């Protein structure tokens, strides 16, 4: 989707707010910690999301005014809500009613439950991860060193093909292997793994600018065509 999230090459966002690392606090509100626990706890069990693809598209679907104002972990709350309702884990109306409860009475007590087996299950996700590397029977279309041209495509669903990299000549830097394909997986349409490549682009091609800058971008095979 050509959405607010796809910011590379945009102007007007201003100065980077530098902070010394030792002062760069992770969390300032408990709900932000809770957001982390909700995301990893659900993903560990495949609830609403099996990996990060489904996660990301829920964020990208946010209203632009929310995306820019919610704060980071607000994005995470939005996507958990989106995906749990979309998959039928949670009912929309029940979630709205319960949200109203906590809006009107923020100190409403949270139910407590210990589940040590669930703890171990969550730990396994944390340490074993969710590698998207697969094997497929097809051979790669492109080779290291090949000059490619990226496509003029505009998926209205999820994609990892940033707008600033579209309709650009680049050079294949590495063939990683076949990875789960985000444009399908985000929408629960199958892993449908495709070869993933790292591709170098020069500043002159990206921007028409004159410095010794380049960008390395990881692109799935279907984002590109031969020259």
């Amino acid at each position: 989707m050509n959405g607010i999230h796809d910011v590379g090459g945009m102007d007007g966002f201003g100065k980077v707010m530098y902070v010394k690392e030792e002062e760069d606090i992770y969390f300032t509100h408990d709900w932000e910690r809770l957001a982390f626990g909700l995301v990893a706890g659900c993903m560990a069990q495949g609830l609403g999301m099996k990996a990060f693809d489904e996660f990301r598209i829920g964020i990208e679907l946010m209203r632009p005014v929310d995306y820019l104002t919610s704060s980071y972990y607000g994005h995470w709350i939005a996507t958990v809500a989106y995906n749990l309702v979309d998959t039928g884990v949670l009912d929309e109306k029940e979630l709205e009613e319960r949200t109203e409860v906590f809006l009107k009475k923020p100190d409403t007590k949270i139910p407590r439950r210990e589940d040590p087996a669930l703890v171990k299950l969550v730990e396994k996700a944390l340490y074993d991860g969710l590698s998207p590397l697969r094997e497929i029977s097809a051979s790669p279309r492109f080779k290291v060193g090949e000059r490619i041209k990226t496509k003029n495509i505009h998926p209205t669903g999820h994609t990892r093909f940033p707008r600033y990299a579209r309709v650009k000549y680049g050079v294949i830097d590495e063939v990683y292997g076949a990875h789960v394909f985000p444009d399908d997986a985000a929408h629960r349409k199958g892993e449908n793994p495709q070869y993933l490549y790292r591709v170098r682009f020069e500043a002159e091609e990206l921007w028409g600018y004159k410095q010794k800058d380049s960008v390395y971008i990881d692109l799935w095979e279907s984002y590109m065509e031969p020259v």
Binding site: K15, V16, C42
Partner: protein, 202 residues
């Protein structure tokens, strides 16, 4: 709210907080989550993980040339052998700064960052200004961090558009003759492992 203009009105932060609690409430009531499962996550990402893991890798590469060469030839195998592997750190690559090549890492599309090796990303890494600008005007962005590269240094910006992740290996500074591996690790900043700073000589 004028119904022609609902899009002008953002959710307040109170809404996100309420919605987080409602999610927690419902998920625990339905048996999908537990109090201790949520705590275990929080402990892991706020306390267990951090940039000291990457620091140790950098200090080992500075001390042990054979380790450095292995790390750069096959960082995924090496890093996994060391135990720096897990969610969002399944495929970590190391990119070496040299005198004429400076590497800077971004996730323009979101915030991707190798949690098992570096912990959580900087505040600014996740926000639009860095993400938008660093791919286009990296020299301008690096000057905001206090890093003013000569025109003759080439900059390579690495956009984390897949699940592949990237750590920068910064150069060992001058003035560190006699400093042990353990002491060298203490010099490795988080920011140097993203490419927005070099290491100062002590």
């Amino acid at each position: 709210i004028d119904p022609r203009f609902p899009h002008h009105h953002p959710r307040p932060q109170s809404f996100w907080e309420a919605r987080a609690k409602a999610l927690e409430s419902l998920l625990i009531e339905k048996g999908h989550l537990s109090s201790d499962a949520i705590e275990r996550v929080i402990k892991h990402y706020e306390h267990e993980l951090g940039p000291m893991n990457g620091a140790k890798v950098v200090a080992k590469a500075w001390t042990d040339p054979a380790f450095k060469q292995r790390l750069l030839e096959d960082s995924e195998t090496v890093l996994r052998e060391l135990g720096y592997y897990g969610l969002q750190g399944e495929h970590i690559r190391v990119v070496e700064n040299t005198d004429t090549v400076h590497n800077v890492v971004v996730c323009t599309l979101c915030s991707c960052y190798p949690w098992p090796l570096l912990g959580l990303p900087p505040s600014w890494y996740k926000e639009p200004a860095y993400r938008a600008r660093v791919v286009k005007e990296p020299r301008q962005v690096l000057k905001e961090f206090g890093l003013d590269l000569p025109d003759s240094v080439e900059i390579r910006v690495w956009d984390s558009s897949s699940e592949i992740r990237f750590m920068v290996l910064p150069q060992r500074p001058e003035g560190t003759e006699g400093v042990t591996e353990e002491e060298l690790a203490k010099l490795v900043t988080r920011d140097s492992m993203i490419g927005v700073a070099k290491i100062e000589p002590p």
